[PDB]
């Protein structure tokens, strides 16, 4: 949501730094365009109908940032990494959207889902197999995060569960992007793990920080019976208001009357600075992680996009 | 149907082709299971709920005989190649199936699938980039054929898209395993190019021979308004049982009478030949290709199976 927006429109102080990234972004969004238009006309008419004309890209914009760190910045196979990662998003949302007439756009949207994966992989075989190998992997979490999300806790602690979730369906491909972009443009291992783990701690910052103004500013997960990690922290207290969270929070909501009296009984319990805590500890590691970079302005701009994030929640936001 | 499954139990002649095979095959069979097997419980006890005991594989079997034509049959490659054939193939038939309570049953299907793609591009990850790059085409292709089979024929010829649509769905996967089990075990690039235009062939004549037997010995491709390549040459003729014919097909059909008057007039037409034709002129493309390989047991065996497929249907059956 509007974190991972947001994050793309946090200004670098750099103005070199900007126009390079802007071009080489021309340059992912062509090579994606032609990737999405590729193949029989029928099938991509449909992919251009599910393509939601979107603005600014994350991911490719991370994966790209985090090439700076090697000896060939920005170069063509970091671009066509920074593709591979956002026509992966992009399945994946295609996929997860069908489970979330009806017959037909449900077959269409799995297909289009399918035939991004093969151009992933056209790709792929021209940037090595270690990328192919990392993408078996990430891919693989990503899938493991929805299905955990489709099963639920089942008997398992409901915060773990929500984390596990988070750091599978949204860590894993911002955390992909950082190493990628790395390693294609010949990063020092160090630098490249460093780049992978930062992606990750950013990915649970962006998510937690989304949950956190969901609740306290609609509240449209509450009506769903999605209880993210403020509302679990709030559940777990031996409180007054704990017990009345208990008590009421059994499914989803239903009158904007009783999601109301939630969201102020969520006001009144220590959820939401239970929550931000968490986004600290996270902040805290990708800290430790851009400690194992070399200072810069790309490094700073990393920083700030994680700090700005974390504002819109923290102290004094 | 039929076809593909008897194929796999053409006995060879040759009796240690058949030991050497059997054997490759139980180390593709533990593969294929670890494979299917890997991941979280929750999302394994699923895969494997979905598992249908098969039997006889014929897409890693055509793998394996034509690895015979390498200096490296039935080498490890070889094997984990014809896994990732068939993985691909079993991916397919999960989104297939969807397309063809019960909200979660999709949901699930559709990321059985998916894990399944991750799973399969692990293994491709140590087979090499050119496998990859392999992958990304028969995979797209494979696609392509469910979505052109899913929008239908629109205004072409609907023969030439019946045609488009087995070669892309079933043709370009079995052309896959004869590729990828000859490369893998070092073939000639002759001998490579030959059994991938063989398995391509032989999935043609699979399919319309299975088509020609549904309809001439229930016809049950009829009454969901499948008009299989004997029906489609029916409705093409200048005949009172074409113009009856023609009358008669527009969608799909309801009662046994219909059904069964239909199944008689496709039989007073040329239809069943027109289709048989078809099958002996893939056929002699088929042996048009055996012809580019050494004499051999296995290339007896090959032809075998081809034979055995068209005999179901063919002069004197």
Request: glycine fraction near 8%.
């Amino acid at each position: 949501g509007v974190s991972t927006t947001g994050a793309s429109q946090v200004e670098f102080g750099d103005p070199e730094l900007t126009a390079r990234i802007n071009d080489a972004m021309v340059q992912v969004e062509e090579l994606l365009h032609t990737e999405l238009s590729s193949g029989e006309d029928f099938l991509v008419d449909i992919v251009m109908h599910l393509t939601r004309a979107g603005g600014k890209r994350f991911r490719p914009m991370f994966a790209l940032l985090a090439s700076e760190f090697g000896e060939k910045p920005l170069s063509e196979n970091v671009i066509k990494a920074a593709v591979v990662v956002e026509i992966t998003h992009l399945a994946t949302l295609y996929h997860d959207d069908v489970m979330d007439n009806a017959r037909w756009d449900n077959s269409v949207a799995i297909l289009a889902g399918d035939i991004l994966l093969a151009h992933a992989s056209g790709l792929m075989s021209q940037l090595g197999t270690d990328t192919v190998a990392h993408f078996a992997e990430t891919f693989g979490e990503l899938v493991t995060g929805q299905m955990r999300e489709t099963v639920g806790p089942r008997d398992t602690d409901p915060i773990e569960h929500y984390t596990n979730v988070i750091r599978e369906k949204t860590g894993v491909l911002i955390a992909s992007a950082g190493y990628l972009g790395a390693m294609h443009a010949g990063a020092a291992p160090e630098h490249i793990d460093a780049l992978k783990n930062f992606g990750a701690a950013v990915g649970m910052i962006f998510q937690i920080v989304d949950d956190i103004i969901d609740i306290f500013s609609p509240g449209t997960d509450l009506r769903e019976g999605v209880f993210t990690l403020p509302v679990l922290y709030a559940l777990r207290e031996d409180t007054p208001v704990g017990a009345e969270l208990r008590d009421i929070l059994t499914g989803p909501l239903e009158d904007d009357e009783t999601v109301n009296h939630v969201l102020e009984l969520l006001s009144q319990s220590g959820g939401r600075q239970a929550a931000l805590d968490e986004v600290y500890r996270y902040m805290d590691i990708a800290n430790a992680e851009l400690d194992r970079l070399p200072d810069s302005t790309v490094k700073e701009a990393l920083r700030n996009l994680a700090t700005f994030t974390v504002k819109r929640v923290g102290e004094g936001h």
